[PDB]
Amino acid sequence: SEEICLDHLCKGCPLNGSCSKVHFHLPYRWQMLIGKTWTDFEHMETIEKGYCNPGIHLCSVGSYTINFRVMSCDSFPIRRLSTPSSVTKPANSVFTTKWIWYWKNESGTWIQYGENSNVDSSYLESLYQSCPRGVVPFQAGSRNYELSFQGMIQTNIASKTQKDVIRRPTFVPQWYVQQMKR
Ligand SMILES: Nc1ncnc2c1ncn2[C@@H]1O[C@H](COP(=O)(O)OP(=O)(O)OC[C@H]2O[C@@H](O)[C@H](O)[C@@H]2O)[C@@H](O)[C@H]1O
Numbered sequence: 001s002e003e004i005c006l007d008h009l010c011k012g013c014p015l016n017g018s019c020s021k022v023h024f025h026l027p028y029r030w031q032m033l034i035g036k037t038w039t040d041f042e043h044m045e046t047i048e049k050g051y052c053n054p055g056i057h058l059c060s061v062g063s064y065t066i067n068f069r070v071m072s073c074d075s076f077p078i079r080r081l082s083t084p085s086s087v088t089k090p091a092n093s094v095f096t097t098k099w100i101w102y103w104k105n106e107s108g109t110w111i112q113y114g115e116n117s118n119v120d121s122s123y124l125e126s127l128y129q130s131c132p133r134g135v136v137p138f139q140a141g142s143r144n145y146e147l148s149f150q151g152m153i154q155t156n157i158a159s160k161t162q163k164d165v166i167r168r169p170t171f172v173p174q175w176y177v178q179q180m181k182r
């Protein structure tokens, strides 16, 4: 499994070293692939802070230049392990990952769904979890759209205009993860 263990972050994982899940001190783990071994980056929090900004697809960390779109760096491929999505666990599970869904508007900027769309980030995330190849119809004002997960785009069904859609976590710094563990 590539899923960061929630129990290890909170009160503790009873499975100890035999847990099938990943045990890490953060709810995210950023890694590069060198040979046949995934290797931890050094400045995970800086990378995560860049990832969680939807208007940022480039992140220079160390000598590395990271491209989030492609999930590679220099030439090497990267990945972000994660706790489960927050819609998959009760609200008590404070270490779940909260995924925000955004669309890019006329004026070039990223607007959160719900901020007006009749779908919000929890809606879309829930559908995306229960069906990642889905197409979500929705309405905004008097206009009607379809959001294609597998394409990560929204299309106005009348004019067929397309707009990008992006899914990124909310950021938590390590100091706040430590506060949550108190
Ligand atoms: N998911 C959304 N949620 C809220 N508002 C949205 C969303 N997506 C687009 N909009 C906004 O609603 C308006 C509609 O834009 P689009 O539906 O993306 O595309 P389009 O219908 O081609 O643009 C409208 C224009 O096209 C012409 O047919 C007509 O003259 C109209 O002025 C724009 O202001 C756009 O920024």
Ligand SMILES: [Zn+2]
Binding pocket: 005, 007, 008, 013, 015, 016, 019, 020, 021, 022, 023
């Ligand atoms: Zn565990």
